[PDB]
Symmetry: C4
Subunit: 100 residues, 4 copies
């Protein structure tokens, strides 16, 4: 099943299975992701930072690799990983990787 | 209400409420933004630099965080923040952040 | 008149007047740009490098500012400015700006 | 013949001839690329990293120039060139270019 995630007009596509492998995240939990469903467009809409999302989707595609894009600052990216609820395990890895 | 902002073919989407929170800017003022409405496509069209716009929309989404993308030079970005009329408060913060 | 330039699937939009201000370039010369018209899609198609094009269109929008994106290497960008026939005046400025 | 390659929602377009010049790669071999055909959308779908793909398509357009985008880390890019089966000749050049 193909899913369309619209981040501020930038459309990402993936399979439901890709998101569902991390069920304790916003996009992996139907109950949380469905709060963001747009019934008019059959998409999930986020009125959020666009350049961070490459990395949020790749976290799922890669089975857990969390990497901040260089064109996106630390604090911006930190707020997005928290919003998408990637988990304390992933936040720990990220924190070691950047210093703090 | 969903808004489509077409910057040189790159389409951004946001909510009207997101833009309207900064009413003393081009995109937050209906009177100014409507000069750029494209009645054929039901979008606002800007024939302008594309890579700067991520940051112009995120200024609204973040409630005021103004950040220059690294792939975009200082002078290019400076001209865009002036064009979008982000305000002297925001221009001051930006100026401290980059030197000048 | 709105123009759609499809660079390898990345669609850029501008006005004809924007391109026509530099008539001695590929995109500013109807005779040269029309070799790339796609009658099925009513677009100009280039099966070329995508990240360089932001900067090729901005050269026209800015009235002549030629800048290489940082995510695009020198030799890649040099080949694109030559292909788009931006002119020896612009190529000189670029050459000073990068060394050689 | 125009081909649409959908990488996680980012659509790339090229000509079949462009891909077919490197027949010993995934995208240059009909038998391998067709495993990824999406009959509902008449596209080839890859649920993969988006920022690396500029460079994978440009490898074909340029007749062999393989370059890692700067916004994409070494290990991420290395996994994509292996997946797309660009060849040991190209992997050797890449390895010299980055160290290892």
């Amino acid at each position: 099943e193909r899913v369309v995630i619209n981040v501020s007009g930038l459309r990402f596509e993936t399979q439901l299975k890709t998101l569902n492998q991390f069920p304790d995240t916003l996009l992996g939990n139907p109950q949380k992701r469905n709060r963001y469903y747009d019934p008019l467009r059959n998409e999930y809409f986020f009125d959020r930072n666009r350049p961070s999302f490459d990395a949020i989707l790749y976290f799922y595609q890669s089975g857990g690799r969390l990497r901040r894009p260089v064109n996106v600052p630390l604090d911006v990216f930190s707020e997005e990983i928290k919003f998408y609820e990637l988990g304390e395990n992933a936040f720990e890895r990220y924190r070691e990787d950047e210093g703090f």
